[PDB]
From Swiss-Prot:
Keywords: Activator, DNA-binding, Metal-binding, Nucleus, Receptor, Transcription, Transcription regulation, Zinc, Zinc-finger. One of its GO terms (cellular component) is transcription regulator complex. Heterodimer with RXR. Interacts with NCOA1. Interacts (via domain NR LBD) with CRY1 and CRY2 in a ligand-dependent manner. The keyword Iron-sulfur does not apply. It comes from Homo sapiens. This is Nuclear receptor subfamily 1 group I member 2. GO terms for biological process: cell differentiation; cellular response to molecule of bacterial origin; intestinal epithelial structure maintenance; intracellular receptor signaling pathway; negative regulation of DNA-templated transcription; negative regulation of transcription by RNA polymerase II; positive regulation of DNA-templated transcription; positive regulation of gene expression. The chain holds residues 143 to 431 of 434 of the full protein. GO terms for molecular function: DNA-binding transcription activator activity, RNA polymerase II-specific; DNA-binding transcription factor activity, RNA polymerase II-specific; nuclear receptor activity; nuclear receptor binding; RNA polymerase II cis-regulatory region sequence-specific DNA binding; RNA polymerase II transcription regulatory region sequence-specific DNA binding; sequence-specific double-stranded DNA binding; zinc ion binding. Hyperforin binds at residues 66, 104-107, 218. It is found in: Nucleus.
């Protein structure tokens, strides 16, 4: 790995730890389904609130988690030099295209494939299959057992996609995305020699293509819900254009 590739991962890792509240400590004041996902809420005192689903009862809450997560993704991008050196218009166009993808890549780090639950600090999202592109993605990506460096690089590649509808400096964004892909490839060939990690780089690139597919599929479905039962917050509207 060259010094630049090293300074690249560091700038990415530094942006991650600064904007990723892995314990969801600042996530409060969120809506709950006032009386297929189980919801657990561990209290500091030791009390536990569990929710067993019965159908738009979880949209409000889920909308609060999204906004909280989205805010982390925006802060991540804005603290990255390669991102700030881009025209505001391109920052917005890129953020709207990767927003969901980066949230998923992040949710995967707190995903427990064993128990099939997202341990988000005090909160917990358990299931009640795998034919769902969403769940299959989380399980497959988890199986790869990636390092933190490999996750932030996946976020970089995703964020700096030149093919996002609205990008102007698609030439600059394209060169950046390539420098990020190369760094990931070099990092893998220099830290993971095990025969099991063969073709790892290409497996990661296929997952991102899957994520791009899942993302484009989600948007449509979310807009179909917003068309029937509005739930999107102001921030979710700025991103999905509503």
């Amino acid at each position: 790995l060259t010094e630049e590739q090293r300074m690249m991962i560091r700038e990415l890792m530094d942006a991650q730890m600064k904007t990723f509240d892995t314990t969801f400590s600042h996530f409060k004041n969120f809506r709950l389904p006032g009386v297929k996902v189980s919801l657990q809420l561990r209290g500091e005192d030791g009390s536990v609130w569990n929710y067993k689903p019965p159908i738009f009862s979880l949209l409000p809450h889920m909308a609060d988690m999204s906004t909280y997560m989205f805010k982390g993704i925006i802060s991540f991008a804005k603290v990255i030099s390669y991102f700030r050196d881009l025209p505001i218009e391109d920052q917005i166009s890129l953020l709207k295209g990767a927003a969901f993808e980066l949230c998923q890549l992040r949710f995967n780090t707190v995903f427990n494939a064993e128990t099939g639950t997202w341990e988000c600090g005090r909160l917990s999202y358990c299931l009640e299959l795998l034919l769902e592109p969403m769940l299959k993605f989380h399980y497959m990506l988890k199986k790869l057992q990636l390092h933190e460096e490999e996750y932030v690089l996946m976020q970089a590649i995703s964020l700096f996609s030149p093919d996002r509808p609205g990008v102007l400096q698609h030439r600059v964004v394209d060169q950046l995305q390539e420098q990020f892909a190369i760094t990931l490839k070099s990092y893998i060939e220099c830290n993971r020699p095990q025969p099991a990690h063969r073709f790892l780089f290409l497996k990661i690139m296929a997952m991102l293509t899957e994520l791009r597919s899942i993302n484009a599929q989600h948007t449509q479905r979310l807009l179909r819900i917003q068309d029937i039962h509005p739930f999107a917050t102001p921030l979710m509207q700025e991103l999905f254009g509503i």
